[PDB]
Coordinates of N, CA and C in Angstrom, one line a residue:
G104 N 131.2 101.2 88.4 CA 130.2 101.8 89.2 C 131.7 101.8 90.3
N105 N 131.2 103.2 91.3 CA 131.9 103.6 92.8 C 131.0 102.8 93.3
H106 N 131.4 100.5 93.6 CA 131.7 99.9 94.2 C 132.2 99.4 95.5
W107 N 133.3 99.2 95.2 CA 135.1 98.9 95.4 C 134.8 100.0 96.8
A108 N 134.3 101.5 96.9 CA 134.7 102.7 98.6 C 133.6 101.9 98.8
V109 N 132.5 101.6 98.3 CA 131.4 101.0 99.5 C 131.5 100.2 100.3
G110 N 132.6 99.5 100.0 CA 133.0 98.2 100.7 C 133.6 99.0 102.0
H111 N 134.4 100.2 101.8 CA 135.2 100.6 103.1 C 134.9 101.7 103.9
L112 N 133.6 101.8 103.2 CA 132.3 103.0 103.9 C 131.2 102.2 104.8
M113 N 130.4 101.1 104.2 CA 129.8 99.9 104.7 C 130.3 98.7 104.4

């Protein structure tokens, strides 16, 4: 799932 990208967002 897209969880890594979330780190850059919030």
